[model samples]
Every structure is written in structure tokens, then in C-alpha cells.
Target: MVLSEGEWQLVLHVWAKVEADVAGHGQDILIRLFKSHPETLECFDRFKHLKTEAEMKASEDLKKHGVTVLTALGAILKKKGHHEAELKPLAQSHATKHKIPIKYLEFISEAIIHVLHSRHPGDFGADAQGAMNKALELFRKDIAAKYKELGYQG
Candidate 1:
């Protein structure tokens, strides 16, 4: 799943906006994920106690963890190549330790897209959305492959 130069440009162009405030954007994405898929909250010991939106939004742990999540994503995007090396450890930790299903990758991706569209109303036209989706699809596939390789089956 190789993105052409233009596709790469489109994805990174928008990603720069996210990079500027990765912590906030990441928190927003995670908040959406927990709101839409409450089961995911159980995977995080620190965040599992956040029973309300205000609690989740205001937690220092959630904000820090949000940066961790988006920082990994930013790394993969900046690499400008296949993500096997970057995602392997992530997949292993989530699958073996957290027991999270691979579908959560897709879930977070959806949260990201929703946040992007809603946060920046005019930022994502058809082509930008397509490029972002394509990149996330590649990310999901690569991470799932790593999970399979680790024999966690998640």
C-alpha cells in the first residue's frame, strides 16, 4: 500500500495540523473512541476508571497516553515507507499483554477521521479523506500482520 507523492503530501499536509497539537488531538480521538466503543476503555487501567466524559477529558493520564498513541502514529506517517518495523512491538504489546483485538486499530482510525472532519470542517474534501483512509488502512493491515506473526490472533 504505497502512497504516491501527491497522496503522501496530502496526508502529511493535514497531519501537520495534528502534529502541532498532538496531545489535544490525540485526546480528542481517544475520547471519541471510548464514547463510541466503551469496551476499549477496559483495556487501560489508568483510564478505565473514567466513567464520565468530563473525567476522561480532564485526566492527566489520558492526556499523556493520548500523546503516546498519536506519537507512534506520527512516527509511522513520517517514515514514508512500510510500517512493519514501527508497528510490530505495538501489535505485540496490545495483543499479548492488553489482549486487544486488531479491530481497535480500525476503531481508532475511525475516531481520528471523525475528529478531523468535525474539528476542521473544511479541511477534508474527497481526495484528502481518501488519502488519509488509505494510509490508515495500510497501518491497520500492517499491525494485524504483526499480531498474526506474534501468534496472538487478535
Candidate 2:
């Protein structure tokens, strides 16, 4: 999505905030995935076992998982379609090996909108929301296409 000047600025500012606290923001997204959509949690055999908040909080593996997510996003944020090559192995594995449908993968985009907005509180105005709204759509669609190309029916 080609953003306006203000939108571009918000994108940069939002990412800057994310970069400053990658672990925390990433962790929040994961916890949200668990809390808002327990079904997604069940997709991960390891995390499905750590169902409770206390359990998730204490699991060092969860923290690593969070960082891993953020690291992937950071790469996407750095470039455009180039990151797809970087993500193809994971995408293919998810589609074939894990049987994670594209819908589940797309849900992360919404989860991200919440993660990005909630962290900034009142500062997340319409412009910021609009920018991220479009950005998330593009990101989700691109990644979802990858899953489909790999034979993800959903």
C-alpha cells in the first residue's frame, strides 16, 4: 500500500516504537493470539500445552518465539517482496507440514493492528490506524498468497 506522507511517517514512527521493544511487543502479540484465539494456540503443539497465563509468562520458549516473530516482521519491514523468499520455507512448512491454513496466518495481521495500536494508547489516531490498516492488508495478502501458492486450501 502506497501511503501518504503522514501515513509514511506514522509507519516509521510505529516501527521505531516496535523496534525499541521488539520482545515486549512480540510477546504481546503471541499472548493475544492465545487469549483472543485459543484455536490458534492449539495449532502449536508446544504452546497448546502452556495454556495458562502464568505458564505462558514463565516459558522462556515463549519469549524466544516472540523474538522470532518480531525478527521476521523486521525483515519484512526492511524490504518488500524480498522477504517472501526469506519466509517461503516457513510458509511452505506451515501450509504442508503444519497444515496451518492461510486464514490463521492472516489473523496475525489483525492481531498486529491491535498490538500496534494498544501500545501507543491515545496516540493511535485515524491516520496511524489508516496507515497500518493498509500496511497490514498488503502484508497479510502477500504472505497469504505464498501459502496458497504452496497449496493451502484455506
Candidate 3:
């Protein structure tokens, strides 16, 4: 739940490198997640029915959802540690309304970092990796805490 000032700056720097292409990168992340963990698709009504990689890639719904996911990440990244207001509704909606398992958050977080590294190999040293990982790990816990508050067991 902590990133030093230097670490935070490194995180923002790496994020800026990808910000211009957020949608495309976001789509890449979702595609990777869905491919690696097919069960995660069960949480996405729009995507669960998409049986092939080609089909999912072409899906407007999938593209929009990917953008939405990354937009939230951008928003969360903009905040220091006070992203609870933003994280709460997302957690409540996905945890209870969508009935998505908490594990999927971890899955998506991993996919996010993996895509970041894969897309920009030279940009991430251990410093950037550690910062990014800490930030997303904090996000996962924040969202998980909200899920717990709403009676979703971890």
C-alpha cells in the first residue's frame, strides 16, 4: 500500500509511455488475461460468449470494456492513496452485482503488468517494475477490502 516518492514517479513515467495507446494496450491486456485464464471470461457476459481470439479481438464490446478498464486504472493512478471513492462502486458492482470472484482482480492485475513489460521491454527496470507492481497490488487490496465489506469472502 506504499510507494515512495521516487517509486511513484517511476510508475507515472512508465504509465505515460503507454497512456497515448491506452485503449490498444488495454485490449491487449484483456486478450492476454482471457487467453491465460479462460475462466475469467465467465465474469464478462459480453466476452464469455466470444469463443475465438479472432472473435474477441474484433468485438466492439470487448474493445469498449478494455478501454473502460484502463480508464479506471488511469484514474486510480492519478490519485495518491485516496482512490477509495473510485474503487468502492467498482468493487461493489463487480463483486455483488456481477458476481465476479475476487481472484479475477488479481488475474487482471497480473495481466496488466505483463502487458506493460511485453509491450515496452526496454522501459522497465526493476525500479519501474517494483513501482508498478506495488501500485496495482495496492489497488487489488483496496478493491478486495470493499468486496469484503459487502460480504464477498476472499
Candidate 4:
């Protein structure tokens, strides 16, 4: 998906924020995430600790992948001419993978939106919300495609 200038900027901003926040404190973030969504912990193995340079690189890769997903979502939104419908399936895929209820994804969205708004109040507006929706939609589709490509159907 091709994102508009504004949407792309938002994605970049989010990626930077997430990376910056996690780089130095990823363990804390992981802990918090696990507490909030316990089932997600099951997806990780004993060797997944973020204490090494390799682990940090993996985190960076995840952030880059996330940005790519957001970009795809922007493209999808432009082509579909609507946002909400496109986001539902994405949310469903996330729910399925993480064992997180779809409602939790919604909550995560709201929480992230709130955090972004609080940090950059000037940037929080309808367009930002639209970009976020685009990101979420693309994230789901990208992950689903990856799973399918790997011959995993669930």
C-alpha cells in the first residue's frame, strides 16, 4: 500500500517512537504487554529475551515490518475508499495469532492513539486517526499473508 505524505509521516513517527521507547526498555514493555495480554507470552520461546544486540536487531526488524504494514494499509484504504471494513479482518487476524480478543486490539488501538495524542497533541486529529486505522488494517493483512505463505492456516 502507498501512503500519502501525511500517513507516511505518521507511520514513521510511530515507528520511531516505538523503537525509541523499546530500545532501552524493551524488557519493561514486554513485561507490561505480557501482563496486559498474557496469552501473547505463549508465542515466545525461552530464547527470546531482549538482552543482546541480536535481540535488539530483531526488534528493529519488527518495527520496520510494522511500518511496511502501515504503508500497505494506506494503499489499501486509498483503493477501497473506506477504512472501517478494511480494519476488521486485520483485527481478526491479530486476535487469532496472539490469542487476544478482538476487543483487546481495539483497546490497544485506543491506548496507542491516546498516547500519541498526548505526546504530540498538535498532530492528533482526524487524519491521524485515519492513518492509524490504515496502519492497523495493513498490519493484519501483512501478517495473514505471511502465515499463508508459510502454509500455516488457522
The true-structure Cα RMSD of candidate 2 reads: 2.2
For each candidate in turn, the TM-score is 0.94, 0.84, 0.93, 0.44
lDDT of 4: 0.51
Model 3, span 18-130: residue lDDT tens? 78897788788999999899999887765788888888879888888888988888888878667989998898888878877767888988898898899889898888998
Q: Which model, 2 or 4, shows the larger TM-score? A: 2
| Stronger candidate by TM-score (1 vs 4) | 1
User: Number of clashes in every candidate structure?
Assistant: 0, 0, 0, 1
**Stretches > 4 Å off in candidate 4:** 24-29, 45-126
- Tens-digit lDDT track for model 4 on 1-154? 7557778576656545544544333333343444555554455555245454345345764445445544444454444334545655654555455444434444445545555555556656778767876765555455445445545543
For lDDT, the strongest prediction is 1
- Candidate 3 TM-score, true structure as reference: 0.93
Per-residue lDDT tens digits of candidate 1, residues 1-154?
7789888888898999898888889889999999999888888987787888888889988999999999899899887656678887888788888888878888889999998887777878778888899989888887777888887576
- Sorted on lDDT, highest at the top, how do the candidates line up? 1, 3, 2, 4
Off by over 4 Å in 2: 1-6, 80-83
lDDT of each: 0.86, 0.75, 0.84, 0.51
Q: Write the per-residue lDDT of candidate 2 for residues 36-91, one digit (tens) a residue.
A: 87888987777788867777877787878899988877677655334677668767
Q: What is the lDDT of candidate 3?
A: 0.84
Residue-level error in angstroms, candidate 4, position 31: 3.9
Supply candidate 3's per-residue lDDT for 144.
Answer: 80
